[PDB]
Amino acid sequence: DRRKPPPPDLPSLLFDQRIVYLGMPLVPAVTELMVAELLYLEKQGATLPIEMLINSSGTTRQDGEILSFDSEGVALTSTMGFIKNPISTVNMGLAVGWSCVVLSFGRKGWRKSLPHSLAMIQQPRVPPTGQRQAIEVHIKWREVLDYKRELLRMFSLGTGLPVDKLDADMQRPLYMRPQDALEYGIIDEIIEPNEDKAEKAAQYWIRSGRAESEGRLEQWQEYLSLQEEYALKDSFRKVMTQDLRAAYRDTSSKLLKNSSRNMEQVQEFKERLPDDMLTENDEVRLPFSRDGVKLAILNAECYAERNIARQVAANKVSVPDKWRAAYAARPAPAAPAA
Amino acid sequence: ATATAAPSELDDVGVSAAAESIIQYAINFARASETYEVHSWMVLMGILKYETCTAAKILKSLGLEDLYGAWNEVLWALNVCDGLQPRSFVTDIKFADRAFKVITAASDFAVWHGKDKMYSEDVLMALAAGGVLEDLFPDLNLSFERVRKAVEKESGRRYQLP
Amino acid sequence: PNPLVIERFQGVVSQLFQQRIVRLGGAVDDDMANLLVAQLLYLDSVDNKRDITMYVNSPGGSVTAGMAVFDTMRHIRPDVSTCCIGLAASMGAFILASGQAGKRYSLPNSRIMIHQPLGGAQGQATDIEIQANEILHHKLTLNGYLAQFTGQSMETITKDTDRDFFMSPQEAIEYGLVDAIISKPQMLQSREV
Amino acid sequence: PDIQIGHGEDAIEMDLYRYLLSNRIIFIGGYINDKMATQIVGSLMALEAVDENEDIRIYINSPGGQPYSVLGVVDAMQSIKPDVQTVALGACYSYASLVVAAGTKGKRYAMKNTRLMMTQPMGGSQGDIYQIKATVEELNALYQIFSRYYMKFTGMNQDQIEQATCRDHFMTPEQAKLEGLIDEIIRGKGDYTVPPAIVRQFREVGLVDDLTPGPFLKVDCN
Amino acid sequence: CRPPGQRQSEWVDLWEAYTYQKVVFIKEAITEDVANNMIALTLYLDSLDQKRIYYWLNVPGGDVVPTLALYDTMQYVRSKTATVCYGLCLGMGGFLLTAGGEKGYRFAMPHSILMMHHPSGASRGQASEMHIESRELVRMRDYLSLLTSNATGQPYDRVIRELSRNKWMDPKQAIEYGMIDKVLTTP
Amino acid sequence: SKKVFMIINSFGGSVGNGITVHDALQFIKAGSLTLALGVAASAASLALAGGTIGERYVTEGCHTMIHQPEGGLNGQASDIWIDSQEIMKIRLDVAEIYSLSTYRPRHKILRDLDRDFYLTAMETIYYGLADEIATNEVMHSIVEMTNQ
Amino acid sequence: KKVFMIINSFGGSVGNGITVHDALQFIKAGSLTLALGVAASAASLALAGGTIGERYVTEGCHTMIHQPEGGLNGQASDIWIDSQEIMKIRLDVAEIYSLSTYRPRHKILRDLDRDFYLTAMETIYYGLADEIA
Amino acid sequence: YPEGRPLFLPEAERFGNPPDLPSLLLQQRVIYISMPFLPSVTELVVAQCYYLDFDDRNRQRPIYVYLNSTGCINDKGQAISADNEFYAIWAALGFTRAPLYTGVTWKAQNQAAVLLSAGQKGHRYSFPHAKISTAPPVMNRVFGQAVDAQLQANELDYATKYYAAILARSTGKDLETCQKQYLSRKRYFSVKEAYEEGLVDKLVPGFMLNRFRKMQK
Amino acid sequence: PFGLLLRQRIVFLGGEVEDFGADAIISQLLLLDSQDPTKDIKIFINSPGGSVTAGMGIYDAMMLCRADVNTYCFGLAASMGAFLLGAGKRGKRNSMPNSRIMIHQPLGGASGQAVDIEIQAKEIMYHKANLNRIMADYCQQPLSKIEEDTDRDRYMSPLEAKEYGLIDHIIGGEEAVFN
């Protein structure tokens, strides 16, 4: 055991356990180091696994300042394709751009992430050309297009999703929490915190009497009261909206039109009857709101201070002082004022 | 094992036409409103939609005369109490905790009920054991055990559970 | 630039202004918009009936200063007929859109670019929400106005202006941004065939 | 490509802004620093000397101002004889915002698409504890002065100003007319488009929902 | 080109490892700094013993006084000198390529690019100061031209007329011109 | 040493780094004793709240300032909007982490992250970010553990 | 025993590419050259410099080929001389490509004219690389 | 693998002298604070303290703290760092066991003056031309509402009361008195004025001037 | 517009006061005096400070004028505009209801050999004494109180200053004086 001394520092200490730590913006020096370490770890054995930790912001700073190119990521990802022993990639903190592809490019079922880490994917950008000709602008765009397509193909191998969907999603920043990355295809697992730690934490909070009396109960009560009050306020807003729609239907039941016959005509032969189409053309029905709930009792509140209206009838001829050049608006049998 | 939450266990598993149609309609409704996650109320809407199915006919005998009205009441509750909030685009329609438990319970019922297939009456008992019937029509006093007896009378075969 | 160029251009600017032709050139910052509001108010005071012709040739400009010019155009009495020459881009394009309906023109070889506001949010999370609401309000307002001018729909506009959307004046007419192309007849070259 | 002026073209052909000031119009652009405040007060007093009874019209398109210069300008506006009539254009960002509220009540205007703003007096502490106490007292005195002026012009409560100034508060002409900062909105030839904030205020009172948003801008993507 | 290459028993830097074998890689344009380092290295290498010093040059140019100092140090040492041209030898580098081993020990790689030009310089001041500087620079042109002519075997007057502008050569032109002696190939 | 002692004195750092250190400290099996000397700003407050509950020490003269994530961002209206929504999600992540570390409701934490928020030793222990005043005997024993 | 050159270089001066090509050919045991991601001009020369039969490119890699660049400054005759050498450089680079691709040198000169991009398969077909990883 | 234990002077006298100077001073239990209280100095001093109270057998060998720093405030009077760097140093120097002797070489100013006073009574040294000075704490320029500046004033008043507490314990005076005399305005002390007020206690041991030595020869 | 106001014997002193700015104002006051000796001048002060040399130049010009020179501060008058505002004729100094008045010492420095440093300290101390002596006379307050107040960094409302003796009238009738 003396013959191999203790490792001189921390990178040697980690890399000695086959942990390739990618934690820096993917610059040419970082890419070269990653390639050298992956090739060396295949050399020491191509069955032993490699645990790659990814806390990196891709080829550009999160500020947006381009700092390498779209081909350092292609090198690293094609390297990970070249090495044949299993790679488990754990996402720590940030995995942006190509550093997200690398996260999704590990061995499937072994890609993981910490519970709060963020995996962003966007579309590559390039530094300003500097007023080149026309053909050189076309050629630069073809370069950028080929590298974007490479990013898309590698991200399709990673996630599992078509190229077109990924292209559409990439056009703007796409931020993914581990639940979202797990949904999308980036990762497979989430590294839950240690259970014994959490259990001991809860027990300490209970037993010490800190969770009960340090001011906690008063403001937890305040929190629940605010939640209930705001839920009730939103329910009242929904009630207001539904009553407005009911008023529109009350004042729209006085109609004489032949356009409904046209709407019967346009629809298909199968839907000659009212037969909806299981789509976002979805008619929610308010009128069958005969809840009849005898349990939800009105609280001790007094609405008897509301006045007594004039009790107007709509079956009059008087009209509001408006302007309309249409003379098809005949008075209705129920609306002589129309 | 959570492999029961699989499309095979919906298609490959021997189910009646009624239960399969109910679940497929619930999935169609989860996809339609763009909220790719089936709730237990969407399953109940599947039952109420098929008025011809014996499950919905057992509800008629238990006091739900207005079955179209009951379907619309449930949809209105879903819009208000719950939420038909359209989400983004999930490639695979998911299943809520209550709804997946209702699927497992319906198959477990069928086992103890002798039916080699999974039936709609079993789904209705699964909904009742999850409150869903009493969570929506407390006026009709329609609880898990009342429909337990209703379906016992309907099929005339005693059922027993662990 | 050269002072003699500035003096010649200020002289021809005075001549054009005499002929009731204001002009919007260069990035529309606050200074240019204050100047152009002043010119429009003067031209309203001089005569309340004759048309004003507004020369748009701009690569961009501030949303706020552009809206100062736009409200003054829509408030004054004379009809401000906007004409585009060279490049109406991203706020001169909005200004060109907002010229008197039926009186927005463009020479045949011009480019119209309409897109959404740029900008920046800086500071703590709440300051970034406030500033993102300012930028999103400007985007929604400008898209609503483009829908009003062009006859398109708000969603078609919002889809079309997500990124830079360059258009020839022919495509602009077919869109609704411009109403006519200004050009004189040429001699149709006979081909041997 | 700095700027190019008309002339108005009378027998003299003077600068356009000199012509407009002669016809009693003062333009406020850019930050109200000490030079801008001096120029505006000098213009107000020259116009007063020419005719002490006829209206002065002030166009305000400015991204702020030094607070002391703005207080000087508002004091000069309130201390002159003619009616001062302030039209807001483009932006009026918080200190300029008071300049809009300081027009003769009934004659404060804003163009349909301006962006008013209200903010607490922002300053900045640095150095010894006594310099920081001096900064605290300066910013408290400025908060009191501007809060009292906003109360004076809009009639709001000091509580209401506390909510309306706790953070950068961007307002359309419609909130400004509801609050009292301006008196009339200068619209187009029949332009009544509802801005996104007012649409949200519709949604908060239940007038429109997600199902039936009405003919208003889609704010379902917020 | 950083990694230390292993030596007799330990890890030693690549360029130090080379100089352990008398090989002196010159890779930067000759400024005061690089010239001092290479003069020092030459003197110490001659101090260890006297076998021979191979100079592998990739010089893209340089300043005149430091290059002449390096040349005089190469000529002062007891051990002979051979100069190989990996990459390219421009200007004063092309003059160093004609500074070691007149007897057929200047080599070049097949695609090496060779260039010679009259030494540059710039200096101002009084009138008389410019006289002194101009006379010194003309002395420098003449000295470097004498050295070039006696290295390559071309007439002095020919060299003066040729090098007034830039002069570029492929290794075949350099053999034919006398600038070098052999071209390295796979052997 | 079946404990990892982590000594805190740092005036800031991006909050994402504080989240990373918090997650790592909550992930490793071994316990953690986090000591604050002088100050613990945003990321350092996350790292201080991240230790084993009951062994988050803070000296008498320490201050703990927690502030909401601050970001900067340029681009088109949609890009500003998307980055805005992400920064709000980070603010909620941080509020929830403090809520779970201190047992205060997320709404009182969010109310406090509204503005830069300084806490003394008693204020920090009362609030819940730390658990014990660091007296000399504490890391007397800490050094002795590292030595024993 | 064989120099195994991993190449990923977005750019570089072409003359340095020639120098690395010469250094590669100098050693007698063959050289393997594996390109990752990108191999631009100064590295495209290096990639073409490996042992024919042992030059590999990866599915994602793209090859750049272009003529050399240069800035000149001086009198008219200095400009003429300097133009003549840049032309000599371009002719040499075309010759190296001709040796590696076995394609008409004039055609290679025509393809050098502007920036030239090759996918991995087009790199194989052109002749700069031999196999795909 | 094996736990490599740092061995200390009683048993490390057989391993020779350390290579460079800072290792020498660390071995002599001298912590030379020559540079203003930046986060770097704080980190280095915390690590030195952690190493010194790590394995001292008797931990009565005093720790020397020589100062040549103007504390947390730049030469032109505007804060270069914050007061929390001082707290971290001070706190660290307290978690050891040994008596803490302090000395001034040339300047101990504005925070280093407090840390100077905070040594052992009877064991605070200075060079006879050291300049000592006490100034109120200073914050650096930050922007905001009146509330932000009020928060900074509160923080600075905590810092001022902290320094006044240490100076009261050191100079043996009334707490508010020590606040008024030292921290209220930037005041200068020669070595004699500082000794008069309890800032320092002695010159460095063995300090003997040159012509004085001459005349005793 | 400033031409018409200069015809009306109104002089504006706005923004930072500097050497050239002083020379211009000095000349305007001399012109207004040599033209008309019986009609008052009005000087408006909105200035955040200035140079002590230039400020004392303008003050000398103001004190030379036969025609009584009123001053009317608006917005700011900081430590050198405030002194000049206090140097108007007694009973004819005015301020806006919400102007901010600051009284404070000057800054300075020196460098190199400390002979010039002691000379600069002596000159800054002279400026202190000179300004304070005349400030005490017109504020009608004890020189000790003025010396103490000119030390303290602070703004004051025109109500506080009107009490303190600096200004004499507030234009607005103290109806818009806000704290």
Curated annotation (Swiss-Prot), chain B:
Q: Where in the cell is it found?
A: Plastid, Chloroplast
Provide the Gene Ontology terms for cellular component. chloroplast
Report whether Chloroplast shows up as a keyword of the record. yes
Q: Which UniProt keywords apply?
A: Chloroplast, Plastid, Transit peptide
Primary residence: plastid
- Which top-rank group of organisms is this from? Eukaryota
Look up keyword Transit peptide and say if it applies.
yes
Q: Which family does it belong to?
A: Belongs to the ClpA/ClpB family.
Role noted for this protein: Accessory protein regulating the assembly of the plastid Clp protease system.
The name this protein goes by in its record: ATP-dependent Clp protease ATP-binding subunit CLPT4, chloroplastic
Counting on the full-length protein, the chain here runs from: 65 to 226 of 244
Swiss-Prot record, chain F:
Which compartments is it annotated to reside in? Answer: Plastid, Chloroplast stroma
Q: Which domain of life is it from?
A: Eukaryota
> Which residues are responsible for catalysis?
S42, H67
Q: How does it assemble?
A: Component of the chloroplastic Clp protease core complex.
Q: What does this protein do?
A: Cleaves peptides in various proteins in a process that requires ATP hydrolysis. Has a chymotrypsin-like activity. Plays a major role in the degradation of misfolded proteins.
For domains, the record's comment is:
This gene contains one large insertion sequence (IS1) that divides the clpP gene into two sequence domains. The insertion sequence forms a continuous open reading frame with its upstream and downstream sequence domains.
Family, as annotated: Belongs to the peptidase S14 family.
Q: Name the chain's protein.
A: ATP-dependent Clp protease proteolytic subunit
| Organism per entry | Chlamydomonas reinhardtii
- Biological classification of the source: Eukaryota, Viridiplantae, Chlorophyta, core chlorophytes, Chlorophyceae
Curated annotation (Swiss-Prot), chain G:
* Compartments (UniProt record): Plastid, Chloroplast stroma
Q: Where is the active site?
A: S41, H66
Subunit structure of this chain's protein: Component of the chloroplastic Clp protease core complex.
Q: What does this protein do?
A: Cleaves peptides in various proteins in a process that requires ATP hydrolysis. Has a chymotrypsin-like activity. Plays a major role in the degradation of misfolded proteins.
Q: Which family does it belong to?
A: Belongs to the peptidase S14 family.
Q: What is known of its domains?
A: This gene contains one large insertion sequence (IS1) that divides the clpP gene into two sequence domains. The insertion sequence forms a continuous open reading frame with its upstream and downstream sequence domains.
Official protein name in the record: ATP-dependent Clp protease proteolytic subunit
This chain is encoded by the gene named: clpP
Q: Which residues of the full protein are shown?
A: 347 to 479 of 524
